[PDB]
Amino acid sequence: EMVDNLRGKSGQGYYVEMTVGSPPQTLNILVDTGSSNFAVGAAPHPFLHRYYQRQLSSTYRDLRKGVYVPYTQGKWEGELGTDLVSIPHGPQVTVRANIAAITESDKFFIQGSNWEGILGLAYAEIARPDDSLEPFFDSLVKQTHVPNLFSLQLCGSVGGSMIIGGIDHSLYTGSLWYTPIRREWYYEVIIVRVEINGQDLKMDCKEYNYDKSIVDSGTTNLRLPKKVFEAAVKSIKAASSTEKFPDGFWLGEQLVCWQAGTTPWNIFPVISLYLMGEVTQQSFRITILPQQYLRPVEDVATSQDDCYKFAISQSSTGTVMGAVIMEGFYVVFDRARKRIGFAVSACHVHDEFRTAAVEGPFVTLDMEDCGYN
Numbered sequence: 179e180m181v182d183n184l185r186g187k188s189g190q191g192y193y194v195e196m197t198v199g200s201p202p203q204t205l206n207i208l209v210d211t212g213s214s215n216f217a218v219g220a221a222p223h224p225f226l227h228r229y230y231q232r233q234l235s236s237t238y239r240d241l242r243k244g245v246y247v248p249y250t251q252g253k254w255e256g257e258l259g260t261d262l263v264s265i266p267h268g269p270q271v272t273v274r275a276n277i278a279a280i281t282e283s284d285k286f287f288i289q290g291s292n293w294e295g296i297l298g299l300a301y302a303e304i305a306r307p308d309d310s311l312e313p314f315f316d317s318l319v320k321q322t323h324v325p326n327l328f329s330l331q332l333c334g335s336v337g338g339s340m341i342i343g344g345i346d347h348s349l350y351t352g353s354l355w356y357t358p359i360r361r362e363w364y365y366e367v368i369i370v371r372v373e374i375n376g377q378d379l380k381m382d383c384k385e386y387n388y389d390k391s392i393v394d395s396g397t398t399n400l401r402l403p404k405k406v407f408e409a410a411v412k413s414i415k416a417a418s419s420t421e422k423f424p425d426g427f428w429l430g431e432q433l434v435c436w437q438a439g440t441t442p443w444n445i446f447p448v449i450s451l452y453l454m455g456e457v458t459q460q461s462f463r464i465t466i467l468p469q470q471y472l473r474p475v476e477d478v479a480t481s482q483d484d485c486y487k488f489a490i491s492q493s494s495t496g497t498v499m500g501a502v503i504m505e506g507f508y509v510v511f512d513r514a515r516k517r518i519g520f521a522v523s524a525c526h527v528h529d530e531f532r533t534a535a536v537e538g539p540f541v542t543l544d545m546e547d548c549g550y551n
């Protein structure tokens with residue numbers, strides 16, 4: 179009954195329906211594996227259709243502590259408190275959790291996104307103000323009999339499914355390949371190799387993980403360390419040289435459009451990200467097609483064409499495998515076994531020539547540890 183319980187709009191995040199307070203106040207909350215704070219708009223804002231009204235909740239408890247959270251994009255400040263929370267289209271349980279009441283924000287809420295809050299699903303180590311603020315999932319597991327695990331199937335209006343407490347076999351095909359969660363703070367993993375159209379980038383694998391690599395459903399793009407990003411773009415341009423695009427495109431500052439239905443998918447290469455396996459020197463790879471890294475930008479004004487933005491960008495905080503990477507894959511966040519599984523999704527991207535895939539195992543003779551720290 180949790181299938182297709184996610185909605186969203188490209189580049190604006192995926193959200194699930196939740197209720198906070200008593201009586202229940204329904205709100206759409208963005209699913210974010212890239213942070214650990216559960217926060218909801220709690221005051222009027224230009225882009226908010228509704229918000230959390232603490233005065234109307236008889237079960238609310240103020241913690242008398244303020245909180246500030248800065249993201250890559252946007253930031254907000256609010257008041258900490260606790261209240262009862264439930265997930266209509268999820269496990270039928272009610273738990274008391276910490277909630278940050280957003281009273282001030284900057285470039286956080288998105289006009290027309292349809293969500294009013296965020297659910298940080300990562301670990302307490304990155305929660306603000308500090309790790310003593312128990313994240314929502316932790317509270318959920320402690321207070322209920324929900325297994326310490328959740329899976330996300332993001333599909334490219336959009337939708338998807340967030341299965342809490344288990345794995346839904348009808349949401350993927352083939353095998354599930356697991357990569358270790360290197361450290362329990364962000365969902366940190368290790369990339370051991372990167373290929374652009376079968377051609378290895380030939381780089382010390384530590385570069386791919388400088389200073390860390392994570393799985394973040396709350397970030398749109400595939401963000402790469404400067405060195406890797408430059409190498410990647412050079413290779414993608416080479417592969418697509420039959421057409422020349424302005425530098426602004428490769429910088430993600432400009433759209434590229436083609437007449438409706440004529441996008442030349444074939445001139446863009448497949449990007450392979452090899453992830454560390456559960457066994458020494460073993461790995462598996464997930465393949466990304468341009469249908470994933472060329473994000474469609476819907477606009478009625480430009481509807482005679484199909485327009486896209488390059489969804490691969492530079493980062494100075496490590497590799498971020500965002501939503502465009504997760505789309506088309508069934509991703510299992512097995513917190514109980516400190517590992518993340520990937521499998522081809524029931525809504526995977528593909529055309530008559532290529533398809534997104536999860537393949538393994540691959541072996542490496544190199545004995546180097548790809549971990550940066």
Ligand SMILES: CCNc1cc(C(=O)N[C@@H](Cc2ccccc2)[C@H](O)CNC(C)(C)CCCC(C)C)cc(N2CCCC2=O)c1
Pocket residue numbers: 189190191192208210212213214247248249250251252285286287296304305364392394396397398399400401491498500
């Ligand atoms: C979906 C909206 N699009 C985005 C979002 C973000 C972004 O910062 N997302 C937040 C959550 C968030 C913030 C605002 C609105 C919605 C969700 C995420 O937690 C960061 N995780 C991090 C990176 C791990 C940081 C967590 C900080 C906390 C203090 C732990 C970056 C994007 N960018 C920036 C350039 C490329 C790109 O795609 C595009």
